[PDB]
Amino acid sequence: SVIEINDENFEEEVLKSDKPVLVDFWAPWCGPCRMIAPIIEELAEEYEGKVKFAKVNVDENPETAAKYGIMSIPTLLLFKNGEVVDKLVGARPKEALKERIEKHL
């Protein structure tokens, strides 16, 4: 399943994760975020146990946004071993995200 994370637990849950983490930076007012949400849901089921999926609401988490220069949403950062290993700005199809995830497995 998808997890909601925030300024407080980001380090432990994302940077210290023992598997790849896809982090979806979103906000309630962003239409396209709502468009990719069911996609993020589909992927989390397909990759249960292999990849971790997280959401950060940028309206409540300025520090985490700033720390990665998030200025537009949606933005999807893929992390592995504490490092950002891919970055997608803008809504994208399931297949576009699957491809980037697959590259890092």
Tab-separated table of C-alpha atoms in Angstrom:
chain	number	residue	atom	x	y	z
A	1	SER	CA	0.000	0.000	0.000
A	2	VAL	CA	0.776	3.704	-0.339
A	3	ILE	CA	1.972	5.579	2.729
A	4	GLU	CA	1.569	9.217	3.682
A	5	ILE	CA	4.758	10.664	4.993
A	6	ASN	CA	5.758	14.102	6.164
A	7	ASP	CA	8.673	16.346	7.184
A	8	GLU	CA	9.031	14.329	10.411
A	9	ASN	CA	9.355	10.713	9.139
A	10	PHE	CA	10.743	11.236	5.671
A	11	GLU	CA	14.328	10.453	6.625
A	12	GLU	CA	13.505	7.216	8.360
A	13	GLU	CA	10.874	6.050	5.838
A	14	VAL	CA	12.427	7.117	2.575
A	15	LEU	CA	16.124	7.736	2.955
A	16	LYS	CA	16.729	4.778	5.195
A	17	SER	CA	14.489	2.375	3.322
A	18	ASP	CA	16.014	-0.943	2.280
A	19	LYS	CA	14.094	-0.894	-0.991
A	20	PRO	CA	13.360	1.613	-3.727
A	21	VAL	CA	10.837	4.260	-2.818
A	22	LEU	CA	8.671	6.168	-5.229
A	23	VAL	CA	7.607	9.412	-3.632
A	24	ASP	CA	4.623	11.293	-5.064
A	25	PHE	CA	4.685	14.993	-4.215
A	26	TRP	CA	1.109	16.236	-4.530
A	27	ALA	CA	-1.476	18.579	-3.096
A	28	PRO	CA	-5.302	18.578	-2.854
A	29	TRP	CA	-5.710	21.500	-5.274
A	30	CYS	CA	-3.777	19.890	-8.099
A	31	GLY	CA	-6.014	18.189	-10.629
A	32	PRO	CA	-3.347	16.144	-12.380
A	33	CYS	CA	-2.314	14.749	-8.958
A	34	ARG	CA	-5.769	13.316	-8.660
A	35	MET	CA	-5.268	11.801	-12.095
A	36	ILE	CA	-2.131	9.862	-11.172
A	37	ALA	CA	-3.362	8.728	-7.801
A	38	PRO	CA	-5.139	5.576	-9.031
A	39	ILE	CA	-2.015	4.833	-11.050
A	40	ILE	CA	0.166	5.029	-7.961
A	41	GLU	CA	-2.407	2.718	-6.300
A	42	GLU	CA	-2.191	0.166	-9.181
A	43	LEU	CA	1.589	0.137	-9.060
A	44	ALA	CA	1.713	-0.362	-5.297
A	45	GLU	CA	-0.347	-3.500	-5.675
A	46	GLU	CA	1.685	-4.800	-8.593
A	47	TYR	CA	4.999	-4.151	-6.775
A	48	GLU	CA	3.986	-4.958	-3.203
A	49	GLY	CA	7.070	-6.028	-1.263
A	50	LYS	CA	9.545	-4.851	-3.930
A	51	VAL	CA	8.969	-1.113	-4.074
A	52	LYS	CA	7.619	1.270	-1.548
A	53	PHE	CA	5.226	4.038	-2.538
A	54	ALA	CA	4.858	7.226	-0.567
A	55	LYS	CA	2.999	10.488	-0.858
A	56	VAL	CA	4.017	13.855	0.466
A	57	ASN	CA	1.460	16.665	0.562
A	58	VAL	CA	3.502	19.755	-0.201
A	59	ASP	CA	0.956	22.079	1.428
A	60	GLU	CA	1.772	20.498	4.827
A	61	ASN	CA	5.469	19.686	4.217
A	62	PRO	CA	7.510	22.717	3.072
A	63	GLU	CA	10.863	21.407	4.400
A	64	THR	CA	10.735	18.230	2.383
A	65	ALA	CA	9.596	20.091	-0.726
A	66	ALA	CA	12.387	22.665	-0.373
A	67	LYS	CA	14.946	20.004	0.320
A	68	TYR	CA	14.312	18.561	-3.153
A	69	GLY	CA	13.491	21.771	-5.013
A	70	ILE	CA	9.873	20.740	-5.606
A	71	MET	CA	8.211	23.744	-7.325
A	72	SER	CA	5.652	22.069	-9.643
A	73	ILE	CA	3.399	19.119	-8.960
A	74	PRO	CA	2.926	16.408	-9.428
A	75	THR	CA	6.582	15.435	-9.072
A	76	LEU	CA	7.648	11.830	-8.602
A	77	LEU	CA	11.104	11.132	-7.201
A	78	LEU	CA	12.445	7.634	-7.156
A	79	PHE	CA	14.855	6.952	-4.318
A	80	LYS	CA	17.252	4.094	-3.831
A	81	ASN	CA	19.779	3.926	-0.947
A	82	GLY	CA	19.115	7.471	0.234
A	83	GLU	CA	19.641	8.887	-3.293
A	84	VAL	CA	17.264	10.385	-5.876
A	85	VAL	CA	17.771	8.144	-8.905
A	86	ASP	CA	14.981	9.467	-11.140
A	87	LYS	CA	12.677	12.427	-11.345
A	88	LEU	CA	9.443	12.994	-13.198
A	89	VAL	CA	7.698	16.331	-13.251
A	90	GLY	CA	4.097	16.332	-14.521
A	91	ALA	CA	1.449	13.620	-14.653
A	92	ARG	CA	2.462	10.574	-16.685
A	93	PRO	CA	0.897	7.234	-17.765
A	94	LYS	CA	1.365	3.997	-15.808
A	95	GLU	CA	3.828	2.673	-18.372
A	96	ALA	CA	6.117	5.705	-18.108
A	97	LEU	CA	6.416	5.164	-14.328
A	98	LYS	CA	6.757	1.395	-14.671
A	99	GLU	CA	9.710	1.850	-17.000
A	100	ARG	CA	11.597	4.071	-14.600
A	101	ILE	CA	10.833	1.766	-11.681
A	102	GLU	CA	11.978	-1.283	-13.677
A	103	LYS	CA	15.297	0.352	-14.515
A	104	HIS	CA	16.074	0.485	-10.769
A	105	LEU	CA	15.223	-3.167	-9.993
